[PDB]
Symmetry: C2
Subunit: 890 residues, 2 copies
């Protein structure tokens, strides 16, 4: 069945570029097969020899070919998983049954805990989505075709028409330029994020809640999940996160907020007419009777011809139609208003004619529900009306609440300008104590601070104008104000002051972001110091949110040390919040790759310390993970399934708390790990030199994924990207070798204690299992090839030292997990792209192959390329395809 | 499996009204089962005895119960047909294979004939759709649930959720008042008609054409059906037919035209953005390159924020996106313009900014197609772009072309006013010759006729204003001007003159409607006389359309005589058109019931005389048949399948031409049939008396189906309705008895010749088989019950005389067809509703049970009922349910 895609695609490839090129692709496939089988490193050079001969256009076509074959492999894998799972006729029903049987927990406990449980998924425009959207659509169509084929209800002509359809959709994908020729704007990123709503999420949320209802009825709970119960929520960073991204201007934030609002208004408006058609009963309460009579009083006996259906005054015979007709009116005016507000700078549509409240909208629908229940129509109410209720109470008037993020130093620049212009000193030079006292006096005082005439920089005006934009817009359109590089209470209070002073009517919550290891180590002390300020603790209203980054922690220190310190951080932050009687909700800035704290979602949730969630969780979804977890109905369902099940279990089934011997052991082990890590990534003076040569790191910016224009000073995303492309995964496994070897060295019974830890402590089991997965996706022969082709003859043994540690570390990992179904194959295509990337990198870093209308062939697609005509496109294609095969970019 | 619906519904009925009422329904079901089995006529009285006891509300609930059970039976029947047909893994592929094998016809002949073949389906608002739209939606949902259940890929929770869904949707249907409490407006009728487009037809047409492409490729024709080839078209009468309907005002016609136009604009606009997303290639011709560069010149470098997607100026890298982006612009302005034109009386949107031409729209899409084909992307072009092309070239800028119909006497009134005010005589009093000469002189003259100061009546102004409305609106929004009661060329020329004189820029074609038997007999002479006028023959442009009604023909004369005369009519009209070198297309005003020329569509097409279609057919779809043939994907497909296959076969496989002995035989037989028919329906002086008592005819108007406010002088629709409700079907079989008996009486070998005719002449075979079907749906015991309960003791034997002829005629029918799978059952429910209708009719026509806030029970739903509180609703429910069970109203 693996042969199928190969057959169809290679048929199309021959129909588009001839037999010769299809045969050469087949040869590369056979050599790669002999490599992923026999594992002879000579086969790699044997393959590269074939790659050298290729014409400039032909090499582009070859990279294209293995790239699209990898994408098709991803789609076939998704289809086979969905069907192999569906033909069974963690998991929600299994989780409930286990919670009853294992832990003696009762159904009403599960229902109660589930009612008060919340999972806030926030989508980010982090530049990790390699495939352009124009091609993502084509992928969606193709997986639709392959899903309809993998079935036994095919009627011959339907199968033939799906054959023609899949053929033309493959041809369409292959006929599009996969290379973004200009990087996107923030608005484009927000569009790409929000596209999953009016395609999957919007109908996916009600379906998921309905399934939860079914499971609860399978436990004996006739009651239903409350429509207003916030089991899942969505936030966004698209257009809000401006940290290190000057292209996210205030006007961008206005744009994305008006945008999302208009999308919501449109969706509700498309729903409301069909809901009106269904609610055709004539029985209601005295309550709904009175209200419908009220609407029929001010019924506006008019033509009302702007609508298509129900343009006549709705008779009181059908009262639900009266009320929902008013809901339609306020929806029409909401949509037209947001459309004008976005299109122009203003609208003449009266605000009293629109829905301004989150639940001005909800009130009429709530009334319809109470009516249906009172009159015995609870089944009818638990249908389209319940779907609509959940959609309103989940997506609100603006599909997602937007977060704003900014680095603390910009707020410090603003405040410094304010104190200098006020001739009272320099806020920068002030100590922490002084800043706290001053900020407190201004927060409690009633006199305005700065004025119209405050001297501002483009930066200072940028942040001040973002606050004014926040003031101008509706409060339910925003989420949290996240402070990057937060260290002291003064950083938070500076934001509270700048908000109040910029006349922010309803100021949004402030949340510090601790991402570097130094800041996570001292985070509990800082949060406690903030809670110590009574003025802030009284306004925080017993609830506080603090963000915990995962990307940069494992970059400057070891991955093991970073994970362990993260656990410690969560644990002591919970201790602080409990100490101050504040409900702490922690915001996990997790990535897609394990190097940035990624991995299976339920494993990451299980690896959190116990009693740190408590029915309140907040997790980012990094760009590419949006597509990974919401591009199909089944994917979206399995996602919300995984999240809510993991949280509920972590609430009722606490993970084991570590024994003290395991605490001290992991402290020592973390010391050894960090020394081992910084030994090779910072102490070695030639390391940065070897890195910029042996990995394709420098070329990452050429993909134009995001809108954002030494090794300590680079972003974590291309850091994990470089070692993932070369399939070496250094930042994933580095410290573990020396850590384990030192722990068995110091004591031999520590081997028995490691074996003890792997079989009982969830955090350790997950950590080791993840490292084992990453080893299952690695091959040091690739890094050897990159060294032999790109690293100077001098520090060749350096990489071999690394290659040593790799295997050494792997030997230890399986020794702790106690290890020693036949997918493979895709590594053949991946290998071909690896060799192509190495040799292409060699030809790129040369002088001979450098630079000193319409397009009708692939070579004319890059006319402004500093490198040789056909080369740059080939390199970008290699990165794209290798990323697709590994199902991870950075 | 029949027991399933009974189980589920009766469970809901008990959950809504208690065990007692469910048990009484079960009793009625058992008595009806003993009647449809043992056929004891005592069982009917045994059942009515049980019906008498029922409380006023309970009888309403019982009629409701059997009505909804009948509807569910219809839905289960449709699902079982669709699945029983789908599990085979006439018909298009079979028709092609038979055309090749049987008749030696070649593939290119089939393709050529298919290219030049057209089928114009015109939807009518004829008041035959008994079920209100608010309930039709619920039926659609229920059949969705039942279709998803009748399958073996149910995952337990999915099956349970569909259980809950079907339960709540049944409860929702049963909780709606099935009774239209006010009759609709014409605009509502047009909405109900057009709803099938933005739900089924719009996506159904491209799918059907794709299937035709598949079959052609299964015959060896790699070529595809031309996108602009008009294989199927749609016209409408909704808002245009004003014959005897004063509520269809000119403003109504304006309304329905602007309406349909705005619907089309909206649909195209929703399609165009996704099409833009797919066409992401970069290869085009020099042609499309030049045009896309042209658009990019006037690209309007602006924000363009009123759109959601592609608000940035589209780069020339993707030229298809440039062109389709312009198509999006002109679509947006088309939609906004039609929306303002409808909402207000005017729009400021410039006409040059919109699509004004039928193929100004088509030009850019045609260019995109040529581009894709030239660059080797013909598979991509034959996908969404081809679907869109076919949608444009099939639905145009206004989903349907509207017909206008008016009785000739109104045009005569207008012209008479014009000649009297001009003091030149009285057009009414003028002979035909004089009218022809005068109309001709005015048509060829250049001086205006009437002026602003012409004295007009509300009628005269009605028709004149309809012509002005036609002048104000776009020409591609209208179809034909059909003349009711057309007898002479002067009736047509009067319309041509009134059109030209009302400044109708592009005058629409005029078409006479011959529906009464007298007019069909003399139709060929009249059409020939019209073609004799050289002035008209030169402007008709070799093409002429003439309408042929089926409703009234079988009402004043026998059904047999009417059918036979229809055949003769078509045949001699073709002779006339061939004699004048005019391409004649005939417009068949067929109904849903056989009494109005209904029946299976392919049988009706086979029963047309040979060489009378010639790749041009026009058929009405009477109100209820719209739902019957377009409420589901499968239904719509089977419909277009049936029509196009039947026409193609009737083109390449001509039916046998009747032998002359069969001609004379059918002439005699028709004489005997007409005498036998008028003997009982017009000669009998007490017949009208017996009819107004033994049938529920008088009560038809109580259903409020349409917007239209002796027996010779009634409409054919309630005429077939009355004898269909009583399941006697008098107008279907009346004359056949005496006809056949006289033909075997005059000659004994005429029995051998009848046997000869049934096995070789398609018209006769279809006629007899239809009569046999109608007998398969009849039961004289019902008519006996109606007589015994409602007809006075006096003329009881009269009905028995009819009951005699019934059986006698049936004996003859099977004697010609040579006759002597186990569905039945539904006749049990139908029988229950029959008895209920009879006894309820008896209690309605009395004095004791006559008349001398909100609603919280069924009895308060009719507060303005001249009859007893619970009675009228029960009667309407009986008519609705009986109509549903027989799958025919009138």
């Amino acid at each position: 069945y693996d042969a199928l895609l190969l057959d169809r695609f290679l048929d199309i490839l021959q129909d588009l570029h001839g037999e010769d090129l299809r045969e050469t692709v087949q040869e590369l496939y056979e050599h790669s097969a002999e490599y992923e089988g026999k594992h002879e490193p000579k086969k790699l050079e044997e393959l590269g020899s074939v790659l050298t001969s290729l014409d400039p256009g032909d090499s582009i076509v070859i990279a294209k070919a293995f790239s699209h074959m990898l994408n098709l492999a991803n789609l076939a894998e998704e289809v086979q998983i969905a069907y192999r799972r569906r033909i069974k006729k963690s998991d929600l029903e299994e989780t409930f049954k286990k919670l009853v049987g294992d832990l003696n927990k009762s159904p009403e406990e599960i229902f109660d805990a589930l009612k008060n449980q919340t999972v806030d998924l926030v989508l980010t425009a982090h530049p990790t989505q390699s495939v352009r959207r124009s091609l993502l659509q084509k992928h969606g169509r193709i997986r639709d075709c392959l899903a309809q084929l993998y079935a036994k209800d095919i009627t011959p002509d339907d199968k033939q028409e799906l054959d023609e359809a899949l053929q033309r959709e493959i041809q369409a994908a292959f006929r599009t330029d996969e290379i973004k020729r200009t990087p996107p704007t923030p608005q484009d990123e927000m569009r790409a994020g929000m596209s999953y709503f009016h395609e999957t999420i919007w109908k996916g949320v009600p379906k998921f809640l309905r399934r939860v209802d079914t499971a609860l009825k399978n436990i004996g709970i006739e009651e239903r999940v409350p429509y207003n119960a916030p089991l899942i929520q969505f936030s966004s960073w698209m257009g809000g996160d401006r940290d290190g991204n000057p292209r996210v201007t205030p006007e961008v934030t206005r744009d994305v907020c008006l945008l999302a609002r208009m999308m919501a208004a449109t969706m509700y408006f498309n729903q409301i007419e069909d809901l009106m058609f269904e609610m055709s009963m004539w029985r209601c309460n005295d309550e709904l009777r009175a209200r419908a009579d009220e609407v029929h009083a001010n019924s506006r006996k008019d033509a009302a011809k702007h609508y298509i259906e129900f343009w006549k005054s709705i008779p009181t015979t059908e009262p639900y139609r009266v009320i929902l007709g008013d809901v339609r009116d306020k929806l029409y005016h909401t949509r037209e208003r947001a459309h004008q507000l976005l299109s122009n700078g203003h609208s003449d549509v009266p605000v009293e004619a629109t829905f301004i409240n989150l639940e001005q909208f909800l009130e009429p629908l709530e009334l319809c529900y109470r009516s249906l229940c009172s009159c015995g129509d609870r089944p009818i109410a638990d249908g389209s009306l319940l779907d609509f209720l959940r959609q309103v109470s989940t997506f609100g008037l603006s599909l997602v609440r937007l977060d704003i993020r900014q680095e603390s130093d910009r707020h410090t620049d603003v405040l410094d300008a304010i104190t200098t212009h006020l001739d009272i000193g320099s806020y920068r030079e002030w100590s922490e104590e002084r800043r706290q006292e001053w900020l407190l006096s201004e927060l409690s005082g009633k006199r305005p601070l700065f004025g119209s005439d405050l001297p501002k920089t483009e930066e200072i005006a940028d942040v001040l104008d973002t606050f004014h934009v926040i003031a101008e817009l509706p409060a339910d359109s925003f989420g949290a104000y996240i402070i990057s590089m937060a260290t002291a209470p003064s950083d938070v209070l500076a934001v509270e002051l700048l908000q109040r002073e910029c006349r922010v009517k309803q100021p949004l919550r402030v949340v510090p972001l601790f991402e570097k290891l130094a800041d996570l180590e001292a985070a509990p002390a800082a949060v406690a110091r903030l809670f110590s300020v009574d003025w802030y603790k009284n306004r925080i209203n017993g609830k506080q949110e603090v963000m915990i980054g995962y990307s940069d922690s494992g970059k400057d220190a070891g991955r093991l040390s970073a994970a362990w310190q993260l656990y410690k951080a969560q644990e002591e932050l919970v201790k602080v919040a409990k100490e101050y009687g504040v409900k702490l909700t922690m915001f996990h800035g997790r990535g897609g790759t394990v190097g940035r704290g990624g991995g299976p979602t339920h494993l990451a949730i299980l690896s959190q310390p116990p009693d740190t969630i408590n029915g309140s969780l907040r997790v980012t979804v990094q760009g590419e993970v949006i597509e990974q977890s919401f591009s199909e109905e089944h994917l979206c369902f399995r996602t919300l399934q995984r999240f809510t099940a993991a949280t509920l279990e972590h609430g009722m089934r606490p993970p084991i708390s570590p024994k003290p011997e395991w605490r001290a052991l992991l402290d020592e082990m973390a010391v050894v790990a960090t020394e081992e890590y910084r030994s090779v990534v910072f102490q070695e003076p030639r390391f940065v030199e070897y890195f910029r040569l042996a990995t394709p790191e420098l070329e990452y910016g050429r993909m134009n994924i995001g809108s954002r224009p030494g090794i300590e000073s680079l972003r974590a995303i291309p850091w994990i990207f470089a070692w993932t492309q070369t399939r070496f995964h250094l930042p994933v496994w580095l410290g573990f070798g020396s850590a384990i070897r030192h722990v068995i060295e110091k004591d031999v019974r520590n081997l028995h204690m490691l074996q003890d830890m792997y079989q009982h402590w969830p955090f350790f089991r997950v950590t080791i299992d993840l490292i084992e997965m990453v080893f299952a996706k690695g091959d040091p022969g690739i890094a050897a090839l990159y060294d032999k082709l790109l690293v100077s003859e001098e520090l060749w043994p350096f990489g071999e030292k690394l290659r040593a540690n790799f295997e050494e570390t792997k030997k230890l990992i399986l020794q702790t997990a106690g290890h020693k179904q036949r997918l493979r194959l895709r590594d053949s295509y991946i290998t071909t792209l690896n060799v192509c990337q190495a040799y292409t990198l060699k030809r790129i870093r040369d002088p001979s192959y450098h630079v000193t209308k319409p397009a009708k062939e692939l070579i004319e697609l890059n006319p402004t390329s500093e490198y040789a005509p056909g080369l740059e496109d080939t390199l970008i294609l290699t990165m794209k395809g290798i990323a697709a095969g590994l199902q991870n970019t950075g």
